[PDB]
Each structure stands twice: as C-alpha cells, then as structure tokens.
Amino acid sequence: DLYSRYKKLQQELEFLEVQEEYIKDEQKNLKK
Amino acid sequence: ITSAAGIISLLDEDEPQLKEFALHKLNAVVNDFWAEISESVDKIEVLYEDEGFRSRQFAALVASKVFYHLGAFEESLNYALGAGDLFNVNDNSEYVETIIAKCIDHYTKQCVENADLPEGEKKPIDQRLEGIVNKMFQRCLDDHKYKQAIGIALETRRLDVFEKTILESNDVPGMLAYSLKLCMSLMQNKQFRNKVLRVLVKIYMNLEKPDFINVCQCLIFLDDPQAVSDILEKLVKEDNLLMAYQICFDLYESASQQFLSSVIQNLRTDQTLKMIKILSGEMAIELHLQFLIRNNNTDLMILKNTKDAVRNSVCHTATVIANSFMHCGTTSDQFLRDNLEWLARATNWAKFTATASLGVIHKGHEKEALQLMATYLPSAYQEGGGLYALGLIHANHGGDIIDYLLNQLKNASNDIVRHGGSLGLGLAAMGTARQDVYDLLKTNLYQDDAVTGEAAGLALGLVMLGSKNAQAIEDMVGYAQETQHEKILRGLAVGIALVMYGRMEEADALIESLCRDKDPILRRSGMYTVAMAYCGSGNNKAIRRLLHVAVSDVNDDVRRAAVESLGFILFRTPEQCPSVVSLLSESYNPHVRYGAAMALGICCAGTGNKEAINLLEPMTNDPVNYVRQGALIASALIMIQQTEITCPKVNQFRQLYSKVINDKHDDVMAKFGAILAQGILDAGGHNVTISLQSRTGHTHMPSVVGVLVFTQFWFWFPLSHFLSLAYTPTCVIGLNKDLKMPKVQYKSNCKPSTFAYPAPKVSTAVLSITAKAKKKEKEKEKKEEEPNFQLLDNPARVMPAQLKVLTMPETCRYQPFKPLSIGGIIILKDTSEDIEELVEP
C-alpha cells in the first residue's frame, strides 16, 4: 500500500517531467 | 535557564574525563543550542579523528546531531555511522528517524550501483550501514505487517531479507502474490526481475502445495522450458494431471511458440501424449473455433445498409475486410456467398484483399483449411492472396503448413504470387526462428522486385520476431541502406522493428543508428523498433525519445510513427495515455493529430475510459480527412464490445458511423475509416476482444504484432487483415475432465440490469374558427362517451469487464477448482459419482 503509493508517485513525477519537457520543445517549435 | 554554551571550552582541555563530560552534556543539549556548537566543528571532529581517544564514538554522535541540526545530512550520516551502539540503535528520537532514513537511502543507492556492476568491481558497503539497515528490517518485521520491509528490500535488492520476510510468519502467503504483482507492475529491471522470479519460484516449490499457476506464470518470463517440462513431468508422476492440464493451458495462452516447442521437445526426451497434444495447441485451437462457431452472431443489417451506401469508390476493399473482422475466426462467409457480384466488382489488389478476407474469416481451421482454401478459390492476385490467407489461418500455428508455404514460395511467378506467399509464410512462421525459412525469405528480399521485397521485409521480421539474430539485423540493414523502391524500405522498416520485440535495452544501439540515419523511412523504422522493444513497460526514456522525435523531426511519417508508438509504450497503464495525448490531439499539423488518434486507439485496448472517447469526440470533426479516419478507427478500437450502460457514446458513435458512411460528398478516406470503424465495433460477432495484455497480465505478442502491422496500413491495405492477430476470444470454457464439457449452471452478478449483445404534411391553424370548432368537437366527444444474472453452459462468452461479476456454480452439484475470476479456460472440480451430462457437439 504505502510502497504502492510511493511508486505511483515516482512514476507520475517522471511522466509529468517528460510531458513538461515535450511541452517546452513544442512551444519552441510553435514559436518558430 | 541554561542560556550559555561555554561547555564547549571543556573540549579545549587535555584530560579525557573533561572531554567525556562535555560531550555527554552537549549530546544532552544539542537539540536547543546547535547555534554555538555549529562553530565548534573541528574541536569535536578531531576527538573522533584521533584513534587514541577513549570516547570518540560520543564525539561522533554529538557531531552527527549538530550537523543534522545544521541540515548537512551528507556528513551527519558519516558521523552517526562512525559512532556505534548508542548512535542510532535507540530508535527513539526524531533525529534517529531522519538519520536512519537518509542512511538507508544511501544504502539503496549503493545497492543499485553494486547491482549495476556486480563483477567484483562493486563498491564496498560499510558493515555499520548494513547493520543499521537490517536492524531496521528486523524492527519493522517484528513490529507490524511485513508489507513494508518487503518493499524496502526489493528497493535495495537484498534478496536475503526478501526471503527472510516471505519465509517468516508472513501472516498468509497471499501477500506473496501481492509481491508478485509488484514484481510485474512497479519495476523495470529485467536483471533484477530474473532474481526476484527465481526467489518466488523457490518459495513456491518449498511450500507443502506449490502454487503451480504462479510458478508457471513466472517461468514463462524466466524462459526455462526444461524446468517447466520437468515440473509437468513430476506433476503427472504425482497423479495430479488436472493442475498440469491447467498449467499447460495457461502456458499456451501466455507463453511464446518457441517456448512451447522447447517444452514439448524436452517432454519427448499415456498422459504425456495428451500433454504434448494440448501443448501444441490443437485442443485449444479447436475449443476456440467451437466457441466462435456456436456463439457466432453478426448483425448483417448494418453491412446491408452500408453496402447500399457505397458509391463504387475504393471503400469496397474496406468493406471486404470489415465483414472479415465481423467474421474473424467464425468461418461465416454468409455475406460473401450471398453478395458475390459485388465481390467480383473489385479486382487488381482488391482481389488480393478479398482472398485475404476469405482466409481470415476461416481463421484457425487447421486441417480442413488446406482443401478449404482451394474449394472457394481453385490469376496471380488470386493465388498470391490465397497463400497470404493460408498464412493468416495458421498464424503462429503453421507447422507442416509452413512446409507447404515453403515449397509454395519456390514455385512462384516472381510477382504478386511471391508477395502473398512470402507474407503468408512469414505470418505463419512467426518467431519459429527456422534457418531455412529465413534463408528463403532473404533470397526473396535480395530478388529486389519492389512489392515482393516489400512483403519479404515483413515476412523476415515476423520469422525473426524478437529473435535478436545478429545476422538477421545485419543483413536487413545492409539491404536497407543499399536498395531503391521505397516500398521495400517500408517493408524492411517493420522487418527490423519486429526483430527487436520487447527486448528492452538488449540493443538500443540499433535504435540510435536508425534514428540517426538520413533516410526518413529508417527513422520511422527506429520509432517502430523502440515501440516494439519497449512494449508494456512505460520506460520513460523511450517515451521521451519518441516524443522528442515527434516534436522535432521534419518528416511527417516519422512524426506519425513516433506518436503512434505511445500506444505501444503505454498500453500496460492505460490511465496515463490520455494525459499525454490530451494535447497531441491539437497540433498545428494534421499528421501529429493522426498519430495522436492512433496512439489513443492503441494504448487503451477496450477500456470504457470515456476520456479517450472525449478526446476523439471533437477530433472526428477535423477539417482534415485522414485525421478523421484515424479518429474513427481509434474510437472503434477502444469501444469494442461496449454498450450504452457501459458508456453513453456507443449508440451515438454507431449512428455517427452510419451517417458518415452513407454520406456522398465526404472524402473517400473518411468513409474508409467509417466502414473500418463499423467492422471493428462488431468484429468477431461480439465474441472477441483486442487486448495486448493477457489474462495473467502478460503481454500478448501476436496482438501487439498484429495491431502494429494493421496500423501499418497507410502504406499497404492488404496488411489490414493482420489485425486478426489482435483479437482474443472473450470466453470461459467449462472443461473438467480431458474430454468432458458438462452442462454446469452458473450465474452472474449484474447489479442493475443486463447488458452485452447490443441491438438487432402539416395542418395550418386557421385560428378564425378552428379553436371554437375544436372545443365544440371536444364537447361532442364528451357527449359521445429485470434480471440480475444468466444461466450459462460450457461455451459461455463473458465480457472482459464482467470477468469479476460471475458467480460460482455452488447451487449446481459440480463446482470449479481453478479460481474462476478471469476469462480463458477453467477446470471443474467434479464431485461424487453418477457423472453424466456429456456434451460434444
């Protein structure tokens, strides 16, 4: 349970980081 | 009051007892005055630095507490570990909690480093660190539930404390299964996966009754065919059989073909022949075919109102496959026989498509199929498509049929015949890793006949599927950057993508080489290869790579493939898929939008998410046509075998499909996607479902392979029939003995109602006197005067979302023995004598 929550949080954080990086790249491309 | 900290000067003395007393007093008063002792620093440190000092441990503890109060835990850990006994074993203060947390974080990081390089190069660990770590382990073990020590252990590798935790009181072994869930859900290290699985199977073996289902579902990952073979042998020699029969059935339902071939080969080195027969899959294929035949029900009314809406555009081909989806594995060509003039209204590659549809309808017919293919079709297109359809029938189940295709390729016209024969041979010999078939397909690829090579690439990828043959990939790429005929490059793309199926990081150098290659088809192939290599596990490195390519690359096809790889990367966790693709669906270019739609369709298989549906709702109104087609196909794929009570958009999307297919001014590709969606929605006669996941949470390699080559239909329509490999029957079979199907009566737990099989002038006012006339006419008229469950038999179809709402047939005399909470094939525990009710239709 607690370990499940910790791993959920880690995976969600990594996924959010990936999405944010892709957004920064696509914002740059949209500006271009 | 104690408002001063002049005790630090006692450390400046030389006598030992003065320093001991000062250290003890400071340790007593660290929690309040850390501001002053923060300037002492070295005066305390040298006390621990000198080996000859009597109480260096107390100084180390004081320094660790001071540093922890300062916040520089990287040295507080060192000074706490330097101290012994009273340093942290008290396990009482909050400072102790912080120190133990940080030092075990250091321990788990170091354990990860050691696991990275376990070849003696692994860095050493301070024995005090190990001591505090396992002291924490024992404290949380004897303290309360042991579901936290297990997680900490599997975080820090440490299989010893893992085995201690599971082998201790452990309450009940159910948590062990929970651990197995973790081992298959929240960890991505295959090297650690092997050790965890070996530990699990050992723990299963040493139990009084080993859990055969769990050990088999672990050994399928572990790739130990001889181990499971001898397990089955000892089960048979133990006079068990029934559990061995089950284990074989789930083995075939989950494990790869090569694994089963190795298992039967090891078994070859009474009951054993039956074991081999059900391991080869004859019985399983026959049971699936019987379930499809007996439970076949396709609504030909929608096909009728579609076939009168086609304006004789190319969409006929789509209809040709759409009914095929509705008749996949049902051997029901009733529409094909009834409507034959329009079947002959299409020729050239449409004849190839029609023959492929006829074969895919007769999916898994086995011995009959050889003469059956000749019966309807006894013309290069016709024979090539017949060979391709025969390959469709024996998908991953060729055997002797392979041999036929083998010779059936040698005697070919070096044309469409060779293309179809190569495609069929590659499909049927999927993953067999046979050298002869590889060599023949390599010769076909070297023939350089455009379409022939286009099919040869896919065939060589299918035969080498997940093989990682260095020769295979070497020859494939050597031809890839040596030849013209971009179609052959398109074929070789999937060819090299499939050779690396699910290999994870086994070779990412090829992914880098393909992404760095100048040829756009090579980059598309690199994205397909990363998708196939990282199926299931949502490896964020691969998702980052493909998202970066989709956002930065210049070719639209490679961007499309990079976005489509999201489905292959996230099907195991369908919740995350709409989140990332919530906005991929609104790019300025339409190719990325189509890729987003396809990724949405692929990731969530049949889940009534109502979020992917929500995203696809406005996209199907996109001014661009092919994005609309992709949206329709994806919405169909996600929404198979669903109803209004399951999701409130099924009927609306059905009528939307009808209103676009019957439209006349819409683009040909839009109506193509519409009829494809119609075929997908009722594919298999509401009896099969698409799910890359298996029953036991394993990834189904034929399903992902087939859905990939189906999405590879932008460049080749005949590949659409490949989607057949993605369908899985939604059935549960009541087989108790080796050959008995007793009429066991069990019900469901449908709470509100039942579900499943869905569907089968003006008068003017003239208000001058009309009101008076109507009111006087009114006076003249006055003068004038739900179930909640269903009984089911052995071949009972159950919705995948309704697999948990069944009821054990306890009211019946016979009740099952296998846990009946999932689909597939189960066993029935037979009670006392007077056994009857034998069914064999």
CB atoms within 10 A of CB A17: 12
Residues of A in contact with B182 (CB under 8 A): 3-4, 7
Beta carbons of B744 and B794 less than 8 angstroms apart: yes
In sign, the C-alpha dihedral spanning B196, B197, B201, B207 is: positive
User: Which phi and psi (to 5°) does residue B189 adopt?
Assistant: -90, 110
DSSP for B494-510 reads HHHHHTTTT-TTTT-HH
Indicate the angle between helix axes A2-31 and B174-185, nearest 10 degrees: 10
Beta carbons of B249 and B215 less than 8 angstroms apart: no
Beta carbons of B342 and B373 less than 8 angstroms apart: no
The 3-class SS string of B202-219 reads HHHHHCCCCCHHHHHHHH
Q: Are strands B815-816 and B795-797 parallel, antiparallel or unpaired?
A: unpaired
Beta carbons of B678 and B199 less than 8 angstroms apart: no
B511: CB partners within 8 A, 6+ apart: B500, B526, B529, B530, B533, B545
Beta carbons of B587 and B622 less than 8 angstroms apart: no
- Burial class of residue B135, CB neighbours in 10 A (0-12, 13-18, 19+): middle
Is residue B654 classed as helix, strand or coil in its secondary structure?
helix
Cβ–Cβ of B540/A15 closer than 8 Å? yes
Q: Which of A1, A7, A29 faces B551 most closely, judged by CB atoms?
A: A29
User: B293 is written with which tokens?
Assistant: 């035949």
Nearest-neighbour CA in chain A from B251: distance (Å): 29
Cβ–Cβ of A18/B547 closer than 8 Å? yes
Is residue B395 classed as helix, strand or coil in its secondary structure?
coil
CB atoms within 10 A of CB B209: 7
Beta carbons of B420 and B719 less than 8 angstroms apart: no
Q: Distance (Å, rounded) from C-alpha B585 to C-alpha B591?
A: 10
Portion 790-809 of B in contact with A at CB < 8 A: none
Judged by a CB distance cut-off of 8 A, whether residue A27 touches chain B is no
User: Which phi and psi (to 5°) does residue B521 adopt?
Assistant: -65, -35
Q: Taking Cα atoms as reference points, which of B50, B56, B66 lies closest to residue B19?
A: B56
Q: Which of A1, A21, A29 faces B544 most closely, judged by CB atoms?
A: A21
CB atoms within 10 A of CB B629: 27
Beta carbons of B750 and B788 less than 8 angstroms apart: yes
Is residue B733 classed as helix, strand or coil in its secondary structure?
strand
Q: Taking Cα atoms as reference points, which of B458, B374, B460, B383 lies closest to residue B416?
A: B383
Q: Distance (Å, rounded) from C-alpha B445 to C-alpha B489?
A: 11
User: B534 is written with which tokens?
Assistant: 């990282």
User: B163 is written with which tokens?
Assistant: 């085995």
Entry field: residues in chain B:
841
Q: Distance (Å, rounded) from C-alpha B786 to C-alpha B779?
A: 43
Beta carbons of B529 and B564 less than 8 angstroms apart: no
Chain A nearest-CA residue for B589: A30
Cβ–Cβ of A3/B147 closer than 8 Å? yes
- Burial class of residue B772, CB neighbours in 10 A (0-12, 13-18, 19+): exposed
Vertex B279: Cα angle to B278 and B280 (nearest 5): 90
Half-sphere exposure of B736 (CA within 13 A, CB side): 20
Chain A nearest-CA residue for B554: A29
Cβ–Cβ of A15/B579 closer than 8 Å? yes
Q: Distance (Å, rounded) from C-alpha B658 to C-alpha B652?
A: 10
B658: CB partners within 8 A, 6+ apart: B302, B305, B306, B678
Q: Which of B151, B186, B544 faces A18 most closely, judged by CB atoms?
A: B544
B595: CB partners within 8 A, 6+ apart: B550, B559, B560, B561, B562, B563, B564, B584
Q: Distance (Å, rounded) from C-alpha B161 to C-alpha B181?
A: 19
Considering only CA atoms, give the Rg of chain A: 14
Is residue B821 classed as helix, strand or coil in its secondary structure?
coil
B81: CB partners within 8 A, 6+ apart: B87, B103, B126, B128, B129, B132
Q: Taking Cα atoms as reference points, which of B643, B606, B635 lies closest to residue B726?
A: B606
Q: Distance (Å, rounded) from C-alpha B12 to C-alpha B564?
A: 71
User: B733 is written with which tokens?
Assistant: 């079979």
Q: After which residues, if any, is chain A broken (C to N > 2.5 Å)?
A: none
Q: Distance (Å, rounded) from C-alpha B675 to C-alpha B633?
A: 9
Report helix, strand and coil shares of chain B as percent, to nearest 5.
60, 5, 35
Residues of B in contact with A7 (CB under 8 A): 182, 186
Q: Taking Cα atoms as reference points, which of B81, B77, B31 lies closest to residue B56?
A: B81
DSSP for B17-32 reads HHHHHHHHHHHHHHHH
Beta carbons of B371 and B405 less than 8 angstroms apart: no
- Burial class of residue B573, CB neighbours in 10 A (0-12, 13-18, 19+): middle
Q: Distance (Å, rounded) from C-alpha B632 to C-alpha B640?
A: 12
CA B487 to chain centre: 29
Judged by a CB distance cut-off of 8 A, whether residue A20 touches chain B is no
Nearest-neighbour CA in chain B from A24: distance (Å): 10
Beta carbons of B366 and B334 less than 8 angstroms apart: no
Number of helices (H), then strands (E), in chain A? 1, 0
CB atoms within 10 A of CB B546: 31
Residue B797, strand partner residues = B731
Q: After which residues, if any, is chain B broken (C to N > 2.5 Å)?
A: 269, 378, 760, 785
Residues of B in contact with A21 (CB under 8 A): 544, 547-548
CA B524 to chain centre: 22
Q: Please give the DSSP secondary-structure letter assigned to residue B123.
A: P
User: Which phi and psi (to 5°) does residue B510 adopt?
Assistant: -65, -35
Between chain A and chain B, the number of residue pairs with CB atoms below 8 A apart is 49
Sheet holding B795-797, edge to edge: B795-797, B731-734, B824-826
Residue B796, strand partner residues = B732
Q: Taking Cα atoms as reference points, which of B50, B109, B100 lies closest to residue B76?
A: B100
User: B213 is written with which tokens?
Assistant: 């289902």
Beta carbons of B721 and B679 less than 8 angstroms apart: no
Q: Please give the DSSP secondary-structure letter assigned to residue B723.
A: G
Q: Distance (Å, rounded) from C-alpha B841 to C-alpha B837?
A: 12
Beta carbons of B795 and B290 less than 8 angstroms apart: yes
Q: Distance (Å, rounded) from C-alpha B601 to C-alpha A11?
A: 22
Judged by a CB distance cut-off of 8 A, whether residue A14 touches chain B is yes
Cβ–Cβ of A22/B147 closer than 8 Å? no
CB atoms within 10 A of CB B160: 12
Q: Distance (Å, rounded) from C-alpha B754 to C-alpha B670?
A: 35
**Segment holding B826, helix H or strand E:** strand B824-826
Q: Taking Cα atoms as reference points, which of B705, B244, B716 lies closest to residue B466?
A: B705
Beta carbons of B511 and B528 less than 8 angstroms apart: no
CA B709 to chain centre: 16
CA B248 to chain centre: 21
Judged by a CB distance cut-off of 8 A, whether residue A9 touches chain B is no
Cβ–Cβ of B548/A15 closer than 8 Å? no
User: B592 is written with which tokens?
Assistant: 């990325």
CA B232 to chain centre: 27
In sign, the C-alpha dihedral spanning B812, B818, B824, B825 is: negative
Q: Distance (Å, rounded) from C-alpha B340 to C-alpha B332?
A: 14
Q: Distance (Å, rounded) from C-alpha B13 to C-alpha B15?
A: 6
Residues of A in contact with B552 (CB under 8 A): 25, 29
Judged by a CB distance cut-off of 8 A, whether residue A32 touches chain B is no
The type of residue at B141 is L
Q: Distance (Å, rounded) from C-alpha B22 to C-alpha B750?
A: 74
Q: Distance (Å, rounded) from C-alpha B478 to C-alpha B457?
A: 13
Judged by a CB distance cut-off of 8 A, whether residue A11 touches chain B is yes
What is the distance in angstroms between the CA of the first residue and the CA of the last residue of chain B?
A: 95
Residue B693, strand partner residues = B699
Considering only CA atoms, give the Rg of chain B: 34
Is residue B746 classed as helix, strand or coil in its secondary structure?
strand
DSSP for B658-712 reads HHHHS-SSS-HHHHHHHHHHHHHHTTTTTTEEE-SB-TTS-B-HHHHHHHHHHHT
CB atoms within 10 A of CB B618: 11
- Burial class of residue B551, CB neighbours in 10 A (0-12, 13-18, 19+): buried
User: B676 is written with which tokens?
Assistant: 């494809």
Q: Between the CA atoms of B351, B354, B355 and B357, what dihedral angle is there, to the nearest 10 degrees?
A: 160
DSSP for B431-492 reads T---HHHHHHHHHHHHH--THHHHHHHHHHHHHTTTT--HHHHHHHHHHHTT---HHHHHHH
Nearest-neighbour CA in chain A from B147: distance (Å): 8
Q: Distance (Å, rounded) from C-alpha B317 to C-alpha B315?
A: 5
B181: CB partners within 8 A, 6+ apart: none
Is residue B312 classed as helix, strand or coil in its secondary structure?
coil
Q: Taking Cα atoms as reference points, which of B333, B347, B304, B375 lies closest to residue B675?
A: B304
Q: Distance (Å, rounded) from C-alpha B165 to C-alpha B136?
A: 13
Report the largest interatomic distance among the alpha carbons of chain B, rounded to a whole angstrom.
127
CA B353 to chain centre: 29
User: B605 is written with which tokens?
Assistant: 């298989």
Q: Please give the DSSP secondary-structure letter assigned to residue B792.
A: B
**Segment holding B816, helix H or strand E:** strand B815-816
Beta carbons of B68 and B36 less than 8 angstroms apart: no
Residue reference for tokens 């260095």: B470
Beta carbons of B480 and B492 less than 8 angstroms apart: yes
Q: Taking Cα atoms as reference points, which of B540, B536, B555, B538 lies closest to residue B526?
A: B555
Beta carbons of B444 and B409 less than 8 angstroms apart: yes
**Segment holding B731, helix H or strand E:** strand B731-734
Q: Between the CA atoms of B819, B820, B823 and B829, what dihedral angle is there, to the nearest 10 degrees?
A: 90
Residues of B in contact with A29 (CB under 8 A): 551-552
Expressed in Å, this structure's resolution amounts to 3.1
Residue B828, strand partner residues = B816
B418: CB partners within 8 A, 6+ apart: B384, B409, B412, B444, B447, B449, B452, B455
Cβ–Cβ of B548/A30 closer than 8 Å? no
Q: Which of A4, A18, A30 faces B540 most closely, judged by CB atoms?
A: A18
Q: Distance (Å, rounded) from C-alpha B111 to C-alpha B118?
A: 10
What is the distance in angstroms between the CA of the first residue and the CA of the last residue of chain A?
A: 46
User: B518 is written with which tokens?
Assistant: 């100048």
Q: Distance (Å, rounded) from C-alpha B415 to C-alpha B20?
A: 95
Judged by a CB distance cut-off of 8 A, whether residue A22 touches chain B is yes
Cβ–Cβ of B551/A18 closer than 8 Å? no
